[PDB]
Amino acid sequence: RIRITLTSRNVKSLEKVCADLIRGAKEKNLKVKGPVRMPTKTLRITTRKTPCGEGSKTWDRFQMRIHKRLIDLHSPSEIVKQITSISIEPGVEVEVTI
Amino acid sequence: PGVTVKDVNQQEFVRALAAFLKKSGKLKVPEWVDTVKLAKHKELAPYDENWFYTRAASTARHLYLRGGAGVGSMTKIYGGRQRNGVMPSHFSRGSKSVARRVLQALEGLKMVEKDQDGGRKLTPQGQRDLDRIAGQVAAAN
Amino acid sequence: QMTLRGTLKGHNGWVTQIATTPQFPDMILSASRDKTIIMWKLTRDETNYGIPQRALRGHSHFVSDVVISSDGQFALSGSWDGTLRLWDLTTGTTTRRFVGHTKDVLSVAFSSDNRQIVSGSRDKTIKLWNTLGVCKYTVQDESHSEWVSCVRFSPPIIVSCGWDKLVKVWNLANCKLKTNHIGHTGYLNTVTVSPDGSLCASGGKDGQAMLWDLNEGKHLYTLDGGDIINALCFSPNRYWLCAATGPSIKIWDLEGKIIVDELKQEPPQCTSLAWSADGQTLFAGYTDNLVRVWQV
Amino acid sequence: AAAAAAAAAAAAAAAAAAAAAAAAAAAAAAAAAAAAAAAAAAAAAAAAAAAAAAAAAAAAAAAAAAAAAAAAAAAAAA
Amino acid sequence: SVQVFGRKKTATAVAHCKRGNGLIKVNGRPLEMIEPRTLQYKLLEPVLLLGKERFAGVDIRVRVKGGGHVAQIYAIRQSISKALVAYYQKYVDEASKKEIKDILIQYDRTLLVADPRRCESKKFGGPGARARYQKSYR
Amino acid sequence: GRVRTKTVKKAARVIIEKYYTRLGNDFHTNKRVCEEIAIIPSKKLRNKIAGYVTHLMKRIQRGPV
Amino acid sequence: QISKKRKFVADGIFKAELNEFLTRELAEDGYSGVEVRVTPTRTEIIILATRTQNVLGEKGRRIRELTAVVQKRFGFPEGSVELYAEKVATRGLCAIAQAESLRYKLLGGLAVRRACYGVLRFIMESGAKGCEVVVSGKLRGQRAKSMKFVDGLMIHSGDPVNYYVDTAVRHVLLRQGVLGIKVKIMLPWDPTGKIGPKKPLPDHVSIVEPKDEILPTTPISEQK
RNA sequence: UUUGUCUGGUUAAUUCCGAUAACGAACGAGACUCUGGCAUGCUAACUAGUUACGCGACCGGUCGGCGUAACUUCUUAGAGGG
């Protein structure tokens, strides 16, 4: 019961590496339960635009999304080293616990 | 038919359970039930001096519907709106003294036990004592 | 000598195809642009000829074709999502799901015997399917350079049509390009195979069904009809090989190659042509959401 | 032949030792190299020889972003 | 057996409708036991409109969450009507579905068709979406 | 206001000059036609191009434009 | 331990301070940006520069010095950081490198106009579609004003200014004040993605040409 | 330096039609990104739920009451459709 946990700020690299990891685990046919899409946390900081406070008080709205996914599989726990060597694309980082 | 709390009108049932919690005489009444305010937002003491039995009645009905609750969730149920004078109004929590003393006084007549998770729940005997009162409001129309 | 017998409404969308039954005289399948497949029960009644019995909704987008099984409760359909589903009409269920196209199915076909599914689609492919929901053959198969508007069977060929104007003749279960018939100016919309299995009338943009022989591969006739063809379909017993033009249905009579008559009713367009297999029933589907019935 | 250019070399790195960076795909049959005119030291851009164009790409890919004298090595088709 | 929702707002109601001897229960209380009673006819509107004979084979259990009280009522009646029409299309013949849909749609279209209106966001410079602050000149 | 801008009624006309043998009077056929015959970025331009070639084929077959 | 959000924020602050410090040291090197790639054998930091021979120093002294100072300042462990130099293909399509080049020409001193026209001529000779350079400040006399140098076309609004437009703002310190140098470059299309963006502009309707087919004008078959 | 960019009709818009010594265009508008509204069609899942069960508690019904096997309607969120 080893669960690999993926996190990024963009959806497309995370979707490519999750598709590649389930393709590498469906080619060897371990039991893989599919990607479980955890809800996105928006970090929003709403600051004022003007550096001295003189104008017509227009406000500025920043945000950043965190996309949080996982794959869970039942296997021997040293077979699991060979799948996480194809997943080294930037953005997405991998946290593994048992 | 079979009559539980969830199938009947909830304006008369709490007052009939308050009539049973008056008429048995086995609910203890502590010494300060007649001089207290019931949170920091209310203005006055109750109109009717039978507020303790009515409050214990509704409290056991709330333990009928959702158990796994404690005093700190009983104050989340029993909060209200604070008028603050010239400031805006606020939501301010209910009193833990009344909920602690009502729930221990309902444990005193073997009607109420604690939960496995530390908060509260009903007994089978306290389940029986409320479904019979639902069965007795069920005929009064 | 063909007379229009009325109207049928369950519909909110444009009719594409009508599929009817030899074992069941009172039962139609009507697929349409209301994204459903309707089991109709023909009561053959005075005010409303047949009424809606069961409407099957499994598709996200426009259904283009329905075909029925040997013993119908089972039907195979295709739609503009690109997939095919298997429907038992008594339960109404989607028994199996046939993914593996990339783009929209334009026309499908059933066989008489066991275990043959062909279907043609917009993504320049032709596929043969097993009933397993797994493909019968490995598909690289050097298909049409345009959309495949129709594919048909003969009761051992695959016969197709296209938007690159060469119709085809293929072999069943080797998927080869065996005979290649180039006569058309304009894209090909609808062909048909006659209920013996020898003839191909091949019609299209130009409104011209070119009459082929399917057993030998030779152009036998030329029939210069009307406006743009939506359908070619047979009589079962009468050897007419009639066609459905835009404002009208054209009948031919191949003894003289004479028109019997025209079938009269921007006009709404006739999009469907099917005879129930006893004869003397002529079904026509329209874009103002009537379904029309023609008897002798 | 197969021609492609390599860059970002070093002064203490010599041509006989630079052959072992790309020898995993093919061993270069020559070494042609620019050197400077004032010092006669390494001008550090050159044209290395591989034999076939299949060797020209597969040498190039691993050598790209490979660590040479704490740098990310450079290749382009020429 | 169907379960088919109806929503007005962030209030969401879904009725669980399977075969039986007649039932309506919204989260375990029946339809005559919901708190707002100036709006009592809104939940009863399929019962008054379709009649109790049209419900005569089903056991409908409604589970609600979210929203306010009135949006919850307007999701209850829509989920009940969609429950009976989804049961009628799957298990009864479709002319009965045609009769029930013209008797339900022509009265009120929120019984079968949802509400696409949601609350539009506040923007700056004023206390609501459109309203703006008082803007003294002198 | 629903007025079509320069690209959705110049690009629709340069789509109509060639490729007239594929176009027709129904919108849903021409909407599916427009991705084989062009390279258009995303679909709202493509639905607007398809709406103008359907309106232009509604206009054009009864006289000169 | 620490949150996911505070981890993402603190790594973003690491990118910000690393790019700001590397700009403040490396003016001469052609510094345009940095690239982090982290694997737990060794955490890899890749610098973008057009001239590597000033990145190294004396036989690679400053790149091992840079490894040492990033190891010391951010609390990095002994032997998990090594430092590379990636060669950028086009100096004329990176606004940071050309902004430094105009800054170095004007700081080493030139006429302002012949500096800006050399920059605009090199950018339009490198293969971009367009450019705009504003050098503003105490240009002529003691009253400051705007001087704009454009050539070609520029896109200004919408979402495609985020992937078709490269910009940079830099400061140059002269004896009587500061002057402000902006370089905005539009990139060319380059449909494979070789030196330019993959998706086209969203208003740019490209029509494939029709195939030249002659009609058959007879019904005719062919076997095999 | 001017016409192109206008008498007029139309548009939320120099947005378009039309007139026409102008013809074709570029920036701005529009397109585009994000959000809202739809899906019994796909992908689906003990940090999410439905329901058929098995048992406990209460006079067939109630249980956010305790744990199991099929599904993706309700939750999450992608790929396309619209």
From Swiss-Prot, chain A:
This is Small ribosomal subunit protein uS10. Its main location: cytoplasm. One of its GO terms (cellular component) is cytosolic small ribosomal subunit. GO terms for molecular function: MDM2/MDM4 family protein binding; RNA binding; structural constituent of ribosome; ubiquitin ligase inhibitor activity. GO terms for biological process: cytoplasmic translation; positive regulation of signal transduction by p53 class mediator; translation. Keywords: Acetylation, Cytoplasm, Isopeptide bond, Phosphoprotein, Ribonucleoprotein, Ribosomal protein, Ubl conjugation. Polyubiquitinated by ZNF598 via 'Lys-63'-linked ubiquitin chains when a ribosome has stalled, initiating the ribosome quality control (RQC) pathway to degrade the potentially detrimental aberrant nascent polypeptide. Deubiquitinated by OTUD3 and USP21, antagonizing ZNF598 activity. The modification N6-acetyllysine is found at K16, K57. Belongs to the universal ribosomal protein uS10 family. Component of the 40S small ribosomal subunit. The gene is RPS20. The modification Phosphoserine is found at S75. It is found in: Cytoplasm. Component of the small ribosomal subunit. The ribosome is a large ribonucleoprotein complex responsible for the synthesis of proteins in the cell.
From Swiss-Prot, chain B:
GO terms for molecular function: fibroblast growth factor binding; identical protein binding; protein kinase binding; RNA binding; structural constituent of ribosome. Higher level expression is seen in the colon carcinoma tissue than normal colon tissue. Changing W51R: In DBA1; affects assembly into a functional ribosomal subunit. The keyword Acetylation applies. The modification N6-acetyllysine is found at K22, K110, K114. Keywords: Acetylation, Cytoplasm, Diamond-Blackfan anemia, Disease variant, Host-virus interaction, Methylation, Nucleus, Ribonucleoprotein, Ribosomal protein. Pfam families: Ribosomal_S19e. It is linked to Diamond-Blackfan anemia 1: A form of Diamond-Blackfan anemia, a congenital non-regenerative hypoplastic anemia that usually presents early in infancy. Diamond-Blackfan anemia is characterized by a moderate to severe macrocytic anemia, erythroblastopenia, and an increased risk of developing leukemia. 30 to 40% of Diamond-Blackfan anemia patients present with short stature and congenital anomalies, the most frequent being craniofacial (Pierre-Robin syndrome and cleft palate), thumb and urogenital anomalies. This is Small ribosomal subunit protein eS19.
Curated annotation (Swiss-Prot), chain C:
Phosphorylated on Tyr-221 and/or Tyr-239 by SRC. This is required for binding to SRC. (Microbial infection) Phosphorylated by vaccinia virus B1 kinase on serine and threonine residues; this phosphorylation remodels the ribosome properties, favoring the viral mRNA translation. The modification Phosphothreonine is found at T3, T7, T93. GO terms for biological process: cellular response to glucose stimulus; cellular response to growth factor stimulus; cytoplasmic translation; gastrulation; negative regulation of cell growth; negative regulation of endoplasmic reticulum unfolded protein response; negative regulation of gene expression; negative regulation of intrinsic apoptotic signaling pathway in response to hydrogen peroxide. In the liver, expressed at higher levels in activated hepatic stellate cells than in hepatocytes or Kupffer cells. Up-regulated in hepatocellular carcinomas and in the adjacent non-tumor liver tissue. The keyword Magnesium does not apply. SUPFAM superfamilies: WD40 repeat-like. Keywords: Acetylation, Apoptosis, Biological rhythms, Cell cycle, Cell membrane, Cell projection, Cytoplasm, Developmental protein, Gastrulation, Growth regulation, Host-virus interaction, Membrane, Nucleus, Phosphoprotein, Repeat, Ribonucleoprotein, Ribosomal protein, Translation regulation, WD repeat. Changing K127A: Decreased binding to PTK2/FAK1. One of its GO terms (cellular component) is phagocytic cup. The modification Phosphotyrosine is found at Y49, Y221. It holds the Pfam family WD40. It comes from Homo sapiens.
UniProtKB/Swiss-Prot annotation, chain F:
Its main location: cytoplasm. GO terms for cellular component: cytoplasm; cytosol; cytosolic ribosome; cytosolic small ribosomal subunit; focal adhesion; membrane; nucleolus; nucleoplasm. The keyword Nucleus applies. The chain holds residues 2 to 66 of 135 of the full protein. It is found in: Cytoplasm; Nucleus, Nucleolus. Component of the small ribosomal subunit. The ribosome is a large ribonucleoprotein complex responsible for the synthesis of proteins in the cell. Part of the small subunit (SSU) processome, first precursor of the small eukaryotic ribosomal subunit. During the assembly of the SSU processome in the nucleolus, many ribosome biogenesis factors, an RNA chaperone and ribosomal proteins associate with the nascent pre-rRNA and work in concert to generate RNA folding, modifications, rearrangements and cleavage as well as targeted degradation of pre-ribosomal RNA by the RNA exosome. This is Small ribosomal subunit protein eS17. Component of the small ribosomal subunit. Part of the small subunit (SSU) processome, composed of more than 70 proteins and the RNA chaperone small nucleolar RNA (snoRNA) U3. It comes from the Eukaryota. The keyword Ubl conjugation applies. The modification N6-succinyllysine is found at K18. Belongs to the eukaryotic ribosomal protein eS17 family. One of its GO terms (molecular function) is RNA binding. GO terms for biological process: cytoplasmic translation; erythrocyte homeostasis; ribosomal small subunit biogenesis; rRNA processing; translation; translational initiation.
